Design brief:
Chains A, B: InterPro entries: Glyas_Bleomycin-R_OHBP_Dase, VOC. The structure is a homodimer of 137-residue chains. With 137 residues, the first copy, chain A, is of the alpha/beta class. Chain A is 20% helix and 34% strand. Chain A has 3 helices and 8 strands; from the N terminus they run E-H-E-E-E-E-H-E-H-E-E. Chain A has a 4-stranded mixed β-sheet with strand order 1-4-3-2, with helices on one face. A 4-stranded mixed β-sheet of chain A has the order 5-8-7-6. The interface between A and B is large, with 66 and 66 residues.
Chain lengths: 137, 137
């Protein structure tokens, strides 16, 4: 995690929600991401942090006491997990659908080729692609 | 990157945009993130991938030929960079403001304590927090 312009100790993707319990069920019970942090009533906010898989890179979800909304869902706004082992991919996506989460048709037919898209409680597109990603070279 | 439910080879945060050139100026020229991939005219889409800082965790921005919009900006939707070295933090945020990007007042006064929020071309809140993040323990 040494960037060109600076040294980053950690990186966090923070998103708002109006249903933090639903979010927890999907991410903790569904994906089985480890809860690496949480806070109750801080400046009117409640939140939880999930490892991705650890603290270096993690997710944070927050809900405001006076009502909060999640980002407006965009079908092209994704969180992609490159899972080269097709058996594990099938297992996780199957568990999520059996828990009640919808598999949707990706906007780009590309992610449809060897990929499965499941919407999280707030419509964020969680993609599981059967590959190793990009080489970057 | 060994998750409980599966082995992830890579992780990608993909977001849509209607101004991919502006996005490139901010991320490549501004943040100086390395371009680890790109594609022209694939299923009507154009896109670019930026390391965070490498391929294991990276960002992808896509624009559709037939017009595309970026996610609806939410003031609580963040990308947080934990930069413990206050001098580097000051340097990067200063470069971005001098390039023309706006520093905004975070929703949560929390990120206001030792943190600087700059909006990217499409309103995503890029936060630079002067800390090491969460321990996770």
């Amino acid at each position: 995690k040494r960037f060109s312009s600076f040294q980053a100790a950690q990186i966090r993707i923070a998103r708002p929600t109006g249903q933090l319990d639903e979010i927890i069920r999907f991410y903790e019970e569904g994906l089985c991401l480890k809860r690496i942090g949480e806070f109750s009533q801080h400046n009117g906010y409640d939140g939880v942090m999930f490892g991705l898989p650890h603290a270096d890179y993690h997710l944070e979800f927050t809900q405001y006491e006076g009502g909060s909304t999640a980002p407006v869902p965009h079908p092209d706004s994704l969180l992609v997990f490159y899972v080269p082992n097709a058996v594990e991919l099938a297992a996780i996506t199957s568990k999520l659908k059996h828990m009640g989460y919808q598999e949707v048709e990706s906007e780009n037919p590309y992610w449809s080729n060897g990929g499965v898209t499941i919407e999280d409680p707030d419509g964020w597109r969680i993609v599981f692609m059967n590959s190793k990603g990009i080489s970057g070279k």
